[PDB]
Amino acid sequence: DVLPPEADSSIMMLTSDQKPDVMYADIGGMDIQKQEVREAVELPLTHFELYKQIGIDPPRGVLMYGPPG
Amino acid sequence: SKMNLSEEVDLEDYVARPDKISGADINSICQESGMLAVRENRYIVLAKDFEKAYKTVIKKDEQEHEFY
Amino acid sequence: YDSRTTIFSPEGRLYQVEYAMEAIGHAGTCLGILANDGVLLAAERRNIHKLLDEVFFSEKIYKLNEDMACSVAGITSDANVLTNELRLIAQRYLLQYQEPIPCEQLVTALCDIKQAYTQFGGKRPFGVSLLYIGWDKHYGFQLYQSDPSGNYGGWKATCIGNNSAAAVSMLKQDYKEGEMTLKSALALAIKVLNKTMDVSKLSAEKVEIATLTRENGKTVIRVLKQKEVEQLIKKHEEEEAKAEREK
Amino acid sequence: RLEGGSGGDSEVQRTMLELLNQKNIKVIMATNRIDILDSALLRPGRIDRKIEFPPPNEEARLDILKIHSRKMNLTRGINLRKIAELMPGASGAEVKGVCTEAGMYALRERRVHVTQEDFEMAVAKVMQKDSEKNMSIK
Amino acid sequence: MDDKALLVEVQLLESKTYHALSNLPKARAALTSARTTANAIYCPPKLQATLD
Amino acid sequence: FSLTTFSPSGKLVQIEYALAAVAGGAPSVGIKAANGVVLATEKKQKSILYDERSVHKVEPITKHIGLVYSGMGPDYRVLVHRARKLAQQYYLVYQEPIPTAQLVQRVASVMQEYTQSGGVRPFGVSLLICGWNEGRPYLFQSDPSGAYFAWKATAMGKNYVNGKTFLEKRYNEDLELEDAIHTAILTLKESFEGQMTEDNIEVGICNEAGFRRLTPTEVKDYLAAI
Amino acid sequence: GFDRHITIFSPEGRLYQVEYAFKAINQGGLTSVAVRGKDCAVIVTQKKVPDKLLDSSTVTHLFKITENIGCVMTGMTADSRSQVQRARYEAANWKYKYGYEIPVDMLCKRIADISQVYTQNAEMRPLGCCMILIGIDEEQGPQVYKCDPAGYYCGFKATAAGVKQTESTSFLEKKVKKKFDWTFEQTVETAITCLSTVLSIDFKPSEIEVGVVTVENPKFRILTEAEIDAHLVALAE
Amino acid sequence: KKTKGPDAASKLPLVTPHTQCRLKLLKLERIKDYLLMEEEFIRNQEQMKPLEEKQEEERSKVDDLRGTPMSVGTLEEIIDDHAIVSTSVGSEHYVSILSFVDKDLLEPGCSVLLNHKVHAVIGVLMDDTDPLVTVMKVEKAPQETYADIGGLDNQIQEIKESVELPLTHPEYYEEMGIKPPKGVILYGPPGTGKTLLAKAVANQTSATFLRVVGSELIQKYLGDGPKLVRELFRVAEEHAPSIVFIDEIDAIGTKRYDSNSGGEREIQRTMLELLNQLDGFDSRGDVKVIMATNRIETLDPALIRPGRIDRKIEFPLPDEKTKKRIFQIHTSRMTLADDVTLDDLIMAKDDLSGADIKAICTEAGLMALRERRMKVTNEDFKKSKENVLYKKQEGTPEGL
């Protein structure tokens, strides 16, 4: 047999989706930049079809090298 | 404002003084300070309730006057 | 390895002075070309932010004496004091001898002061190299280039800027002594400045040029204003268009 | 610095001497360290050539836009040559940054034709570096 | 341009007319942009009340 | 050693640190209009214990030369005292030229004791100079190490980058009348955090009639209807 | 390195030596409060006397620079005395060069210029003592100023220096925000209650030394034990 | 763990013309014929077996007792009858091998087989293909000969005499009773150094050769820099007596620095140990340590002394005839031109070293191969001078 679930094999958090904890604009940090982050969410926000045709190469990995600020 | 006006905070509490600081106080500390401004041996959130957590966490790094 | 200015190297080199002179190549761009009946300087205006007014009327080109003018290519802090000292030396010679100071003597005095600055004491070398164009009774039109090492040289077509190697190569390729005139010198200077500045069709604002000419028993140092510079640019553009299309 | 890595550099130098002299294998290096004076080492393995990379010119940058913008869709009319010339100096990586900035700028508008205004907004990616303070000390 | 008071008023008015026309998601998007623009003015006592 | 120093290969590291220090946090915008020059700065005193009519950010060096500055105010006091002495010496040597704008370039040039003789530690203040005794106005900036720049509109604060961007986008322009002080206040507003008032904002104006540090009455009048 | 060792600009764009000297003022264990009033300006500082073998007659931190200007010193006592001597010399030299008495603001400016020269160069070091000087000035009323080891001379109405200077400044900010002018009873009481709330010992009328300059009565009155005791009795009533 | 390697390669490098001709062709045919006749011979002999004698007495007695399953482990210690072997996962066995016991080839610290079950060693893996801890003998006895270098006759004679005091006429100073391992201290311009290597290949025609270049300023706490070379020279004595070529570390690793204490511990360790090994009263062997440097000034006074390190030799710059010879050697392989433009490129040249000669000869072919491809390019007469300038000699601001 093969187990379909994979997240609970070593825990390490699970599906945090479908749950509004902190929506978006309710953050106190406003932007810092948050435009590269919205650029990061462009791929989840569909737009992968717009990644082609328009000829862009959307970013894949986003590293935030900041303190707990 | 998340905890709705700090759970009915008083008027005489404004953040003009405890925020013009230049003492880091990362947003995690800001959330902790918001959740630690909660000494309420009475009905509502007030100024004397604050001063316990308002004078606590005093701001060490200082001396901008030489630079200005 | 570097230390207090007055040092040497295990090999025996003045690496602080060499580093300063190489840094002179970084930033700034001036070139001087000597021709008959007129010797001119061409300078690259580095910052062309629209928020300036251009009221000093000269940034790179400096009038240092009635019969000479210079152009610095180093840090402006040392450049200002060096220009002031150079004018003071020239006017002191004029007071002492009642005669315009020969260009070679002035350049030797300036390079002597720079050699003194790099020689004794815990003082930084003057991180600035400047050209000089001028006229005298003995040698006529002359051009000199002095480096922060204090070792000046008597040149006739040279550049001291960032792409100084490319500019001097372009000069060497298209330099012809004797046949050269003031107008041909202007054309060559504009061409080499267009070569060393990546953006083609250089604006008259980004280029400042000054020509020294010998009138009737009197030296005239005219800085070419915007209209004349852009007319030279237009003539150069016509020449380039004809040369490119005639192939 | 005569550290453990330096001993590795010496043994790397020892290796490349033997195998390259004992072969259907060449080594090509890179040096974005401006000058070779900071890393001058044994000539064999580098005395063959010392080819240098000139920063792309305005026409060279033009070509890099064309290579990078051939895959992409945009408006019918665009003065790519002036777009590249507007960028002061820069490099092909900056050209790649401008091209991906134009795509993202047109991505927010959701249209198939990247306009010149969005492209000039992509030229602003060459900005945000500038010289910050007007040092201008030269 | 780089005006700030006018932009906040325009965005707030745009949010208001979306709400009047019951355009809730666009009103939320305009309101979020109104906040992002409104961070510049520190003490606009009338304007801050309008945003709230 | 005892002068402006610490210059490694191709760099002026000490000067660069001085320029990082003068980044400061006081915008102190300056605008060169057709009629004159406006130097406006921000006086954001810590708490209300401090006073605003006691210390000033704008200092009239002479009859029509006004001065505004940036970080390291104690250095700025010595610098403005030296500038006043130098201008007075020039006026005494060349007696009675009413030297302001034929001196503004000269006084900016004689701002070489300002940095070219640094004094072990270079000055950490960048200052804007205005003068209008030539039939035309003048706006000059001297930085901790450089020299005159002859600006038309600039800022030298924490948000000097966006302040200069606002100045150019708002079109500092050339036909603007003397009342470009409104645009200067707006530029300060971008780099200001609070409800700016007459004592919170100090501005001096230098027109062809002379230089004058605007009193809180006129500062509040201009701040009204903004 | 040596960025934090000598008076040189830090790579981050700061000056750490004066930043350390300002904390040196905090070192020493003392506090002072200066309050400007409707017509007078009063300064009070605690008199920390360890053991009675000392002479309480001369352990003071407040002095007369001239006939109308009085200072209070906070920080190391040696630098404090040196700056007091320098201020007295400056006041005398000003009175000699200019006939009228030196304004308190000008004296503070000169002391701050001297301190700025000290933070300049590298041979010397800044003096770790913060001086608060007060005095009556015609066409200006009472005037209070503070000169710091950096050279920034300012301060007015209510200003404090010392270890617990922040709490005193906060309480005085609360008091001045309460819009009511202080006469020559309320200013002294306000200063006394400020320093008492800062350090709650009830202030037996021997551990503080208050200096007062009024308008109708000029000169820097170093109020005696009887005067401070009377003010304390009136306040605690 | 390593003694020798099978040298069954390098099939007669003496191809006399080295260029495509009939004489070279016939030599290659004789070479290729001799290869097949050998492959003939061994194949004919291996299959035309002399006799069919059972299972070659292999499968009958030992191969079965060796067994099918086996595991490989190192052999640790030897006792009279049994053997102390340290097999895998830290297992140690005291078992007497008696099947496929080649006592000479077993040796301590070598891989041996274990027949599983009743774990008894039954064989040894003589190859073992893993003596990789410190490898310096991989380049042993380089094939370069005297003929590769020319125009250095005085130095070649000097180095040969210094190294043919042993091997040749060893009884000369054996009766003199000194047995001096003095070595040779080589000078030379920085434009050379691998000539200090190429003149060393003259002695490398006999016995093996070891190289220690760059090494380190032995910061290692154990030191052992010059001391493992002493072990390797001892290994060299076990092999044919090799030479140790330590060019550029007799100068840097052994520097005549004025500092006495706090000097990176090399002066304490490296210089002292170098003298100890260079002294014949401590270590024997025909090992000759060739010390070559480009900085004669940094000679340490211990290294200065000819009493322990004798035979100082100076390498000068090549002369006009030497420049002609080295250019002829380097351009012999390439057939520069039919006009033989030889003297024009060296007659005026000065301060040109062996590395520069090799570089310009290589660049001459590269420039011709760039676009001037004409076999023996007629441009090579002047393009050889075109790439002999090549700039790149020295460059430093102006200062003059």
Ligand SMILES: Nc1ncnc2c1ncn2[C@@H]1O[C@H](COP(=O)(O)OP(=O)(O)O)[C@@H](O)[C@H]1O
């Ligand atoms: N609106 C908000 N804006 C910014 N920070 C917040 C907000 N609300 C909560 N936080 C704080 O952000 C913190 C995130 O901390 P953490 O994940 O540990 O930092 P990091 O991701 O750097 O490890 C939480 O502890 C929480 O208190």
Ligand SMILES: Nc1ncnc2c1ncn2[C@@H]1O[C@H](COP(=O)(O)OP(=O)(O)O)[C@@H](O)[C@H]1O
């Ligand atoms: N006189 C010569 N004759 C023939 N070959 C030489 C001569 N000099 C040097 N070579 C060859 O050129 C190469 C570089 O020589 P050398 O100058 O010793 O190198 P480096 O200058 O890098 O130390 C050596 O490998 C050597 O084989």
